[PDB]
Design a protein around this ligand. Structure first.
Ligand SMILES: [Cu+2]
Ligand SMILES: [Cu+2]
Ligand SMILES: [Cu+2]
Ligand SMILES: [Cu+2]
Ligand SMILES: [Cu+2]
Ligand SMILES: [Cu+2]
Ligand SMILES: [Cu+2]
Ligand SMILES: [Gd]
Ligand SMILES: [Gd]
Ligand SMILES: [Gd]
Ligand SMILES: [Gd]
Ligand SMILES: [Gd]
Ligand SMILES: [Gd]
Ligand SMILES: [Gd]
Ligand SMILES: [Gd]
Ligand SMILES: [Gd]
Lengths: 123, 336, 336, 335
């Protein structure tokens, strides 16, 4: 099935956000990213996607449909606003093997704080 | 100059102070070109702006709105080490209008919490200019939050009028004006939050109205009055730099005037003279020099009377000295 | 000058007229410095501002918004006896931007109903300036109510361009612009009150919106049109002084242009030239000099088209003379 | 004399669409000449926002802002305007650079199915804004996008304040336009069938003195992305900007106005070293700057809100070699 995500300049958690920021899906599902405001895109973060999944990067302002195949956790960012915290976590299948690794990886402090919130309060 | 030539120039570290005061500096350059070094940590916290306890999540360079005024001469290179502490939650960046290349330094200074960088640019044009953070996609928000100040690159030989005479000031103050946009609830009371991002959507709605709920100087209504009222004595010359990095203002010293005022904030451009009220366009800092001739309390504020008395754009300078009747005298005091 | 010297200078009483006209005066000063004497009684009354009958409790110096334009030369002292009749109900005060000391004379002219004073100040700088009442705590209200005008201190040698050539105007008109803020009821209709105090809270609310319901010249929409439209003829040089003591405007003569325009309203500051639309910042009065070359009806108004046609900032000057095809000619009139 | 005016050479010039400019020489070639230009007005609906917002535009030459006509001082501009029968509103043109007849508006009122020809002598040098202004509906026709700007350059080209000649390799004209689109009770922009159907609702928005969108070229993002201007290090470029009914404050992010005739008049000395200038509603200015660093630079109304939230921000892509002397990242962003 399909899960729709919006990219906004301002939302529930503050400025520059993906809503929802926690996406639960299964292999074969699609995630459709819709920039409701301009200036946003979606890009997989290096070493924060599962082992055999392909990297991806959409163009700014375009609607992008991601098909997810490999199970595991994926942290995606908005390229321009990553440093301002704009990320989302996609969890494919149950108990994603790489989730603790992604939570521990090096990333901006603001990113880390939002990630922690979404895993607690968004799961 | 080549990299080798720049590496052999003398470097001078400068300690910045908090507005409206400026750090120590000589009008006339002492020596040739030198790489001036200044460091400012950004602190996003909550500052009260009025007596009603209104609060704005300020993003402040050096912990003060507006950031501190850096002062170097033309030709000297300003090297600024910025640091965004892990305690913050948003990535910033600094774009100095007085620089050339990389969106004013914003394209090479994006640093997220826990990151610091160092950018050095040559000050090739003389004049006050406004610097301000502008992260791609959230520029207006960071500037309105109080993330902007101004630097003054003074001519190697100091300042001079339009004919070439030297104008030297005994005191210089920097008043950064800031127009905020605070969200209110249904009853009209300002709303307060707990984090900076929680007030982003509500703030944008107010910013679109192009109508600031408060326009003040130094980050708060009544900030430069009382214990902060500037000071000057009859016979003293004072240069008052003023900057607005998100709104046009019109400075006016009540009881005095801008003898010489570089409205455009560019020294090469001749300074208007005998000015009652000047005009500085959003995104620009100017400067006015005036020699006080009468003692007493004078208010200095954005003429928009509404913006200066109802919003909060009015400061006050206390001046000491002897009154001069020749200039003004009450022949008949108010009576029946 | 010492008191004995000032006391020995010739005094000249001048009868003021009502805008847009200006009292008789000589461009070039006749004789040395002289204490000019002017007296104005303030009258808070009700005046209509539009054709619908909207009424605003105006505070008017000399019974006219904007007050009358006083004219003296640089060096001469302006002595003004102000009188606040007992019939009025609020204390006023006058602050002349062209004076130095005591908040422009507002700190030494606070007079409550039934009191009058006399303040004398030396006109030390040449240029048009805006005066306006400003009682501590209620400044913006008194100015928006129409309590402000402008005085012109002309260089002892008359006015000259930016290179030294003499510019002599055949006639001069003073157009004071005033942005009001009238409260409206639920039906969107303007509200009327009995006394000036009953409209204070509702007005403040409108003033905070920084959006004037009516911006006009002479105190009312259409005040300088019809039989009141200014007049000029081809080959006539006319200087139009304009002031705004509470809002930035941008003058523009439709069909003409400001040959020489001291936008800042300071004579020492060289006058721009060939200007299509100038800019005078709230809290300041400027001056534009232009020699008419074509006959017909021209509208002079704040370019903000909305402010000039929808609010009421547009006057009209009728000009007599012969058309000049060389400058403009309809080769093909509107046809199929 | 009359014979002299009738003997001057007439030359027709094809106009391009903003921000480009037609073909012309800085220094005048030959003596005074009657320049002839023809523009048809087209009233149509154009989108001006990524949400499909639409504004019944009134456009001279089919483009907001109209095209920039360029002649020299002394030359006479003769413009044949044409209002097609398909249109439904009478227009007219008033050029600030002309003298007499409300700037030509009193002798150019043409209703659908009518065209005229008005000639005026360009007696003053400097950029100036032209705009339609039918008696009683001026503000509506201008806000609808019926305004542009013409540049009358000194016969000897442009020079600084000391007489030095300033010759630009390229020139672009960015007309800014503040619209006022009516929204329903839910905050959604409203669309209409014809131009008059939105006259009362638009006036209400215009009274607020708060434009719902302020942009350049007639649409948010019209001069950004693949349509971003262009310039190379060492290139001198003059950027004329006009605002027929709203004050703006231009600013080239990453650069500066080396010489800027803020008032848009050449006779008036050009300020210099300007970070942000100021052009008052009803006036067009011009800034000349030599690019020294390559990369993408944004140029927009400083009112940040008006430049990022409304749509007043374009971008110039510049090619060349970076110059560390001017600016260098000693320590790139890192822990
Ligand atoms: Cu984004
Ligand atoms: Cu920031
Ligand atoms: Cu800026
Ligand atoms: Cu009063
Ligand atoms: Cu004042
Ligand atoms: Cu039209
Ligand atoms: Cu106009
Ligand atoms: Gd403080
Ligand atoms: Gd002291
Ligand atoms: Gd006394
Ligand atoms: Gd009257
Ligand atoms: Gd007559
Ligand atoms: Gd005829
Ligand atoms: Gd296009
Ligand atoms: Gd090219
Ligand atoms: Gd490097």
């Amino acid at each position: 099935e399909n899960i729709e995500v919006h990219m906004l300049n301002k939302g529930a958690e503050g400025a520059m956000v993906f809503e929802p920021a926690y996406i639960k899906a299964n292999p074969g599902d699609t995630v459709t990213f819709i920039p409701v405001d301009k200036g946003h895109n979606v890009e997989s973060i290096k070493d924060m996607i599962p082992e055999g999944a392909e990297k991806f990067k959409s163009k700014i302002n375009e609607n992008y449909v991601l098909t997810v195949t490999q199970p595991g956790a994926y942290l995606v960012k908005c390229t321009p606003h990553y440093a301002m915290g704009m990320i989302a976590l996609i969890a494919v299948g149950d108990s994603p093997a790489n989730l603790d690794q992604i939570v521990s990886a090096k990333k901006p402090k603001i990113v880390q704080e939002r990630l922690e919130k979404v895993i607690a309060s968004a799961k | 100059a080549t990299a080798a030539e720049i590496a052999a120039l003398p470097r001078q570290k400068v300690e910045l102070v908090d507005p409206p005061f400026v750090h120590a500096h000589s009008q006339v350059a002492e020596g040739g070109p030198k790489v001036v070094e200044f460091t400012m940590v950004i602190e996003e916290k909550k500052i009260v702006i009025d007596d009603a306890g209104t609060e704005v999540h300020a993003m402040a360079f050096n912990g003060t709105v507006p950031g501190p005024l850096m002062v170097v001469h033309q030709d000297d290179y300003l090297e600024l080490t910025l640091i965004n502490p892990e305690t913050n939650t948003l990535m910033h960046n600094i774009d100095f209008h007085a620089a050339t290349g990389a969106l004013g330094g914003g394209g090479l200074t994006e640093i997220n919490p826990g990151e610091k960088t160092i950018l050095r640019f040559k000050a090739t044009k003389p004049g006050v200019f406004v610097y301000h953070c502008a992260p791609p996609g959230m520029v207006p928000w960071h500037v309105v939050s109080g993330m902007n100040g101004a630097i003054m690159v003074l001519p190697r030989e100091g300042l001079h009028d339009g004919k070439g005479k030297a104008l030297t000031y005994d005191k210089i103050y920097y008043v950064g004006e800031q127009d905020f946009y605070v969200p209110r609830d249904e009853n009209g009371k300002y709303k307060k939050y707990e984090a900076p991002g929680d007030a982003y959507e509500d703030t944008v709605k107010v910013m679109r109205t192009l109508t600031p709920t408060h326009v003040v100087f130094n980050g708060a209504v009544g900030a430069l009055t009382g214990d902060k009222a500037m000071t000057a004595a009859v016979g003293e010359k004072v240069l008052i730099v003023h900057s607005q990095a998100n709104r046009d203002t019109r400075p006016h010293l009540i009881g005095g005037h801008g003898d010489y005022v570089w409205a455009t904030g560019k020294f090469n451009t001749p300074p208007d003279v005998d000015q009652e009220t000047w005009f500085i366009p959003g995104g620009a800092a100017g400067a006015a020099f005036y020699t006080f001739q009468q003692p007493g309390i004078y208010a200095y504020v954005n003429h928009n009377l509404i913006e200066a008395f109802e919003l909060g754009a009015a400061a006050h300078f206390k001046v000491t000295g002897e009154w001069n009747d020749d200039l003004m005298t009450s022949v008949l005091a108010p009576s029946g």
